[PDB]
């Protein structure tokens with residue numbers, strides 16, 4: 558089974574790390590590739606063999622017109638936001654969900670909270686407070702998920718890989734089907 562999955566969301570939520578941490582089981586953080594690319598993984602899910610094509614995106618505003626060229630024939634989207642970036646969570650509803658739905662009205666969405674590992678980091682919570690902000694909590698992401706009617710809400714870390722595999726199994730599970 559060939560499944561095409563597109564990953565959207567604000568620059569720097571960790572889309573490229575998520576894809577590479579997934580396909581290769583190692584985290585770039587140190588050396589992140591800047592050429593926007595597509596990747597591949599052969600996965601077994603509920604006894605069915607799957608070839609999953611993962612398509613990265615340029616979330617920059619400069620790419621508003623060209624980004625949707627990679628949307629045709631997509632089987633499932635991950636809309637991603639950083640659990641340590643409220644601005645990114647805001648943009649799911651202000652920008653990403655509306656753009657996905659504009660081009661692909663019926664394609665399933667998985668809502669993904671990323672950098673799960675920084676949610677307890679001290680220096681991180683601290684910096685967030687200096688802006689009168691705080692990490693997105695599980696209940697908050699679940700609510701956004703319900704707002705936008707995504708098939709699942711899932712948290713992960715590319716750095717630790719916690720929950721990373723489930724993100725992709727549910728992606729696959731959402732195509733073929735509820």
Ligand SMILES: Nc1nc2c(ncn2[C@@H]2O[C@H](COP(=O)(O)OP(=O)(O)O)[C@@H](O)[C@H]2O)c(=O)[nH]1
Pocket residue numbers: 566567568569570571572573574575585586587589671672673674675713714715716717
């Ligand atoms: N601590 C932590 N940092 C991450 C994680 N995923 C990505 N990052 C960092 O976040 C920054 C942006 O990640 P990248 O994948 O380039 O984001 P993108 O622009 O959405 O594709 C980089 O500095 C990464 O090292 C994560 O799971 N944990």
Ligand SMILES: [Mg+2]
Pocket residue numbers: 572573574613614
């Ligand atoms: Mg990237």
